[PDB]
Design a protein around this ligand. Structure first.
Ligand code: HEM
Ligand SMILES: C[C@]12CCC(=O)C=C1CC[C@@H]1[C@@H]2CC[C@]2(C)C(=O)CC[C@@H]12
Length: 398
C-alpha cells in the first residue's frame, strides 16, 4: 500500500494528490527500494517538525544501522550528509542557529535590496531575441551573484563560481568530478573566511566570524560548513521560486493582470507560489527515537520520516476548498510552512523572498507582455525526486 515516488517526476501533481490521500502519515518508497514514512498534512507536519523525538542523527535510522541501505544508494548524500547545522538537534543545533541568526539578520538581507536590483537590471540587459530560456538566462545566475556578494566572495572568482555551481547542481556530474568540485568550493570559502578575518567588512562571512554568545563562537570548520550549506540549500530553490512564479502568472492570466495593474502586491504572488508550488517537494530525513503517534498510526522507533512540503502546501484542512488552486488573493488562517517550522526553519527565507520580490517586478517592468513560448503542458520537471525544478522556461519576451 506504499507510494513509490517517481524519480523522473513525470507527474508531480498526481503523486502530491496520492500523498495527501494516504492520510497524515503515508507509507512511501524512495527511489531505489528504500521504505520511509511521509507526513503529508500541514497540522501533523508542524507537530512532527517541533517533536524532539524526530532527529536528524542517522545513528537512529534502524534500516541504516542494520546495513539494509546500499552504500551507493543515489539519495545517500541527502540521508547522510555529515556535520552541519543541518544534521544536529537539541543544544548543539540551538548554538548554531543563535550564532547564524546574529550574522544572517533581517537587516543584513534588507540592505541587499539595491545590489539585487542592480544585478537583476544587468541580467535583464543581456536578454536578446524574441524567445529565451528565462531559467538559464535570468533566474539561474541571479542567486549565485547575490550569495557571492552577501558572503563577500572575491568578485574575481565569479567566472569560476558559475562553472563550479553548474558542476555541483548537475545530474550528469561524475563521482571524482563531484568531489573535485566540492574541494574547490570549500577552498574558495576558506580563502573568504581568512580574507575577512584579516579585513572585516559588511558581509555575512565577517558577521559569522564576529558572532558570539557569552564568548562562544563558530570554529573555521563551522563557518565554512555554514557557507557551503547555504549555497547548497539556497541556489536551485530560489531559482525554482522565480520560475514557478512566472509559470503560475503565465497560466493564471487574470491574476497576472491584478498584480501588473497594482491591485495585488508581488509579495502575494511569492507567498502563493511558495504554498501552491514550493521548490522543495520533500525534505530528507528524520528518525524517531521512540514510537510517535501521528493521527491513528504509529511512527515506530528507528523508522524514517520525510516532510512532504509539496503535497501539504495544497492541504484543504489548512487552506480550505480552494487549497488546490493558485489564488494570490486568498486569505488563509494558516501561513504556509514551505520554509519549514520549529528549530530547523529555513534561515534564508527573508533572502529568497527579497530575491523573488525584486526579480519578478523588474522582469515584468522590462517585458510586461512576457508569456510562455510553449504550452504549460510541455514544461518538464528535472529527474530530482525532492525538488520541483524545470529543465527550462521558454518565454516570448514581447
Ligand atoms: C525558495 C527558496 C527556499 C526554500 C523553499 C527553502 C526551504 C527550506 C526548508 C523547508 C528548510 C527546512 C527543511 C526541514 O527542516 O524540514 C530549509 C532549511 C534550510 N535552508 Fe532554506 N529554502 C530556500 C532558500 C534558502 C536560502 C536562500 C538559504 C540560505 C541563504 C537557505 C538555507 C537553508 C539552510 C541553511 C537550511 C538548514 C536549516 C537547519 O537545518 O537548521 N535556504 N530550507
Ligand atoms: C535538504 C536541502 C535543504 C532544504 C531544501 O529546501 C532543499 C534541500 C535539498 C538539497 C540539500 C539541502 C540541504 C543541504 C544539502 C544536503 C547539501 O549539502 C547537498 C544537497 C543539499
Amino acid at each position: 500500500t506504499r507510494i513509490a515516488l517517481d524519480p523522473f517526476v513525470s507527474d508531480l501533481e498526481a503523486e502530491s494528490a496520492a500523498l495527501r490521500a494516504a492520510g497524515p502519515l503515508a507509507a512511501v518508497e524512495l527511489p531505489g527500494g528504500v521504505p520511509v514514512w511521509a507526513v503529508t498534512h500541514h497540522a501533523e507536519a508542524k507537530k512532527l517538525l517541533t517533536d524532539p523525538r524526530l532527529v536528524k542523527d542517522i545513528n537512529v535510522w534502524g534500516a541504516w544501522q542494520r546495513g539494509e541501505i546500499a552504500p551507493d544508494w543515489p539519495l545517500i548524500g541527502l540521508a547522510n550528509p555529515g556535520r552541519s547545522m543541518l544534521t544536529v538537534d537539541g543544544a548543539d543545533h540551538r548554538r548554531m542557529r543563535t550564532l547564524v541568526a546574529q550574522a544572517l539578520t533581517p537587516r543584513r538581507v534588507e540592505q541587499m535590496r539595491e545590489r539585487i536590483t542592480k544585478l537583476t537590471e544587468e541580467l535583464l540587459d543581456r536578454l536578446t531575441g524574441e524567445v529565451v530560456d528565462l531559467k538559464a538566462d535570468f533566474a539561474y545566475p541571479l542567486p549565485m551573484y547575490v550569495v557571492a556578494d552577501l558572503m563577500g566572495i572575491d568578485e574575481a572568482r565569479l567566472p569560476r563560481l558559475g562553472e563550479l555551481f553548474e558542476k555541483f547542481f548537475s545530474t550528469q556530474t561524475p563521482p571524482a568530478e563531484v568531489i573535485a568540485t566540492l574541494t574547490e568550493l570549500a577552498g574558495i570559502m576558506a580563502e573568504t573566511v581568512a580574507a575577512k578575518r584579516a579585513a572585516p567588512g559588511d558581509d555575512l562571512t565577517s558577521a559569522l566570524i564576529l558572532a558570539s554568545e557569552d564568548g562562544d563562537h563558530l570554529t573555521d570548520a563551522e563557518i565554512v560548513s555554514t557557507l557551503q550549506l547555504m549555497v547548497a540549500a539556497g541556489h536551485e530553490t530560489t531559482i525554482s521560486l522565480i520560475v514557478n512564479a512566472v509559470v503560475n502568472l503565465s497560466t493564471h492570466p487574470e491574476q497576472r493582470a491584478l498584480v501588473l495593474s497594482g491591485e495585488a502586491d508581488w509579495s502575494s504572488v511569492v507567498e502563493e507560489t511558495l504554498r501552491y508550488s514550493t521548490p522543495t517537494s520533500h525534505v530528507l530525513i528524520r528518525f524517531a527515537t521512540e514510537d510517535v503517534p501521528v493521527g491513528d498510526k504509529v511512527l515506530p522507533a528507528g523508522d524514517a520520516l520525510i516532510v512532504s512540503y509539496g503535497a501539504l502546501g495544497r492541504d484543504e484542512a489548512a487552506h480550505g476548498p480552494t487549497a488546490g488552486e493558485f489564488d494570490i488573493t486568498r486569505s488563509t488562517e494558516n501561513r504556509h510552512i514551505s520554509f519549514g517550522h520549529g528549530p530547523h526553519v529555513c534561515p534564508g527565507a527573508a533572502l529568497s523572498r527579497l530575491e523573488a520580490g525584486v526579480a519578478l517586478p523588474a522582469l515584468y517592468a522590462r517585458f510586461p507582455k512576457l508569456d510562455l513560448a510553449v504550452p504549460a503542458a510541455e514544461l518538464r520537471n528535472k529527474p530530482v525526486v525532492t525538488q520541483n525544478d524545470l529543465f527550462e522556461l521558454p518565454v516570448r519576451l514581447g
